Design a protein around this nucleic acid. Structure first.
Lengths: 95, 107, 93, 86, 42, 93, 107, 98, 82
DNA sequence: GACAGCGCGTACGTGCGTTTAAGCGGTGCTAGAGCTGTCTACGACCAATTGAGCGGCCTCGGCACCGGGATTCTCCA
DNA sequence: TGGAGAATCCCGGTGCCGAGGCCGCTCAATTGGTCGTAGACAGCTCTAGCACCGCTTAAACGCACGTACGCGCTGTCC
């Protein structure tokens, strides 16, 4: 058995050197249709539109992980808690 | 009689006529100066060269001969001035620069 | 339709710098988008400038200055040098 | 003519994918309290865009969402993307 | 000796003016890599 | 020469809400700038909208959409409301 | 015949003719329809009214009669909707909303 | 026994004084002089509207204010009450000015 | 005639005045220089492009319109100055 | 108040079989993506008039101020 | 826990020029024309968006457990 954390660096490097999408596509499309339900009914979708939607989502959230990680490491920690995200989005001005 | 393109008149690589048309159709001012499209395509090609050259550098560095978006991201982020120009820019399938904060390294 | 893009120009200059190098199609479209955004940002700033001084026509002075105001330092230095060269070459020929 | 109403695909946001997301962020150690937080904030961003997406769709009189719709929305919010036209 | 030093000064003049222009070119610590891309671009 | 601004309308409407209240001139400039800005932002947005649909004419349709864009929620519903009645008023006139 | 201002025709306070001229002179698009300046000015006045009501309330809250920039600031930052609309905006002499975080108070 | 307030309550006094106040916190002439010094670099022998000088300042202090308030957010989340430059820089990191 | 070194004209009491108006209670001694540098940066950017407007305007007097245009383009639109 | 020391107990990371549901073509299938003639009606432009806006000029009225009692935070007790 | 001292607070005079009206006067807002084109629009076509089907496999799940991280507090010193 490995010591916990070296594995983490393993996936860190795997996914930092990789570029392919990280989300199952069907759940994404389903969620999108859910969300769109709220503004107008019966709306048809470009697949590529969905794809870019996804892409944008991960870009947003990934920068979110970055600045949250900075917040946490400033707190001399390594484990992330919602405190950090809330402060981060507040500073960026989303809250 | 034999036409001679304004770009060739500048030894230029983008179409000046195209860009001049777009300028005129783009509703920026009713009247357009003449050397403006010239200078325009010039700086365009400049930036084009600046970016593609790094992209090819990266493609060579990873032993490939066709440049892929990954290279685009790598080159854009590993520049200071370009990245500041494109700090608000997201590239599809671009990933990020592999970079690890020192604090999480094992020791 | 007769969908327009700048791809061929990119291809030529690509050969100009790295004459032996391929490229993604998706990345090519990315290049299209990039050149586009460059166009619009600089154009809009310039048109702002034209309104600003109460002039009605876009010349080289405006475009050059816009290049200054958008580009950071050295990039602008290089581009302005080149634009001077290029407009000189056109007007001279 | 099948028009059903969805429910809870936000839990279609699997735990492993979220962790993978954090790992692309280079994140090392994680709370369980993070995950629902992520689902919510993600949701927020999702509507924030999709709303104006539909706005574009409708002012085109149109019934289908185009990519350029998303493009223009994200550009409104300064989230410039390359690679899809526009 | 006067002729000798005249020789010396002619010899110096090259490198001296070379510095005189190097400073003008490169007074500032600058990423001259782009400056060489100026030439390679032309 | 002359220097055009909005202030008189500001004062009219202020009397229309608080008939019992004065105003600073600096605050007056604040509001002048305010109207300036909002006009510009919304107008440019609508102009883009027109381009996106290859239209050469300004209607209120894009304006409605555009307000929906820039103002959020109750702001928008209110604004579209008064606009709807107002254009109704002029047209029905 | 006797001429009636378009703003009067809508029962308006902002000048339709002035705005319409502004639009024409702005080079935003090649043509302008009739109802657009009206629709715009109406939205304008609605917004102005909202702001003015809030600021007059503020000035009343301090037993003054003249609206000042400070009341503008106090009101607008005290609005959720307006302030998000004006979140990227600074006001001259505006000041801030007095706000002390809890942990900063002595216990 | 001379009467002295405890360390910190005074700070709250000025904090309230300035959070209610609305005016400048900066001296005029040193500020104008810094303006002149920096502007020296780009062009020589420039003239200045005083109104411009003002506009410069208000922009400055407002920007600064946002900066420090975020800095305090940093410090409080960081479980302290004294501000330290690492907070300043980290906030600046977050917002994204390089 | 030359000018220099008025960045020290930004005194510590002014600095802590700003900090207080920001609602801060306790301050490191290292803060002041940090602040001065950051302010240096801000002011440099803004003056720079403001000047840029000035010269293309072919004037020799910086105007408040050039200043407002610069910080509005930055993202801190300042009202109250036409 | 910041900082570090240390111990401790818990919520978190790694294996690990075990489902399971996303994916993947393969197949229908209809709805709206994507067009093209065609014909007005509405703004673009221009031409008589004019009224409202803007600027200059009084004028008085909120309002900052002053200072003196009058009324509360603070800090040991 | 109660008072002493400091800090605020408030209010009624006390100055004072900035809103606040106000008014000649000139130009942009309004008005009635023409005119040609843009855009409305239905049709026509037709494209892509959707629904559906086994079925396999890769990826998510359950859970234990153990393991190291978070956290508390406290002297101490600057």
């Amino acid at each position: 058995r490995y010591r916990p954390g070296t594995v983490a660096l393993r996936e860190i490097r795997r996914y930092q050197k990789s570029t392919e999408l990280l989300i199952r596509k069907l759940p994404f499309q389903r969620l999108v249709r859910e969300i769109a339900q709220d503004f107008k009914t019966d709306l048809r979708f470009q697949s590529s539109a969905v794809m870019a939607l996804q892409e944008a989502s991960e870009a947003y959230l990934v920068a979110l992980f970055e600045d949250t990680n900075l917040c946490a490491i400033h707190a001399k920690r390594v484990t992330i808690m919602p405190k950090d995200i809330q402060l981060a989005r507040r500073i960026r001005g989303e809250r | 009689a034999k036409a001679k393109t304004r770009s060739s008149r500048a030894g230029l690589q983008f179409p000046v006529g195209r860009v001049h048309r777009l300028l005129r159709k783009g509703n920026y001012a009713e009247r357009v100066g003449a050397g403006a499209p010239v200078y325009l395509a010039a700086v365009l090609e400049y930036l084009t060269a600046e970016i593609l050259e790094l992209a090819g550098n990266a493609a060579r560095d990873n032993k490939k001969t066709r440049i892929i978006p990954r290279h685009l991201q790598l080159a854009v982020r590993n520049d200071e001035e370009l990245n500041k120009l494109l700090g608000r820019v997201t590239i599809a399938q671009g990933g990020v620069l592999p970079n690890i904060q020192s604090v999480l390294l094992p020791k | 339709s007769r969908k327009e893009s700048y791809a061929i120009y990119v291809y030529k200059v690509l050969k100009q710098v790295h004459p032996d190098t391929g490229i993604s199609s998706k990345a090519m479209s990315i290049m299209n988008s990039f050149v586009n955004d460059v166009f619009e940002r600089i154009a809009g700033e310039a048109s702002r400038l034209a309104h600003y001084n109460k002039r009605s026509t876009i010349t080289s002075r405006e475009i050059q200055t816009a290049v200054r105001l958008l580009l950071p330092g050295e990039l602008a230095k290089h581009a302005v040098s080149e634009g001077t060269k290029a407009v000189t070459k056109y007007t001279s020929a | 003519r099948h028009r059903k109403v969805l429910r809870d695909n936000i839990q279609g946001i699997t735990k492993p994918a979220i962790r993978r997301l954090a790992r692309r962020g280079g994140v090392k150690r994680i709370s369980g309290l993070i995950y629902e937080e992520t689902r919510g904030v993600l949701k927020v961003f999702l509507e924030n865009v999709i709303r104006d997406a539909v706005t574009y769709t409708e002012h085109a009189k149109r019934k289908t969402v185009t990519a350029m719709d998303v493009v223009y929305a994200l550009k409104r919010q300064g989230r410039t993307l390359y690679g899809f036209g526009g | 000796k006067l002729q000798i030093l005249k020789e010396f000064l002619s010899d110096y003049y090259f490198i001296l003016r070379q510095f005189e222009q190097m400073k003008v070119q490169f007074a500032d610590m600058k990423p001259g890599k782009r400056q060489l891309r100026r030439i390679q671009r032309q």
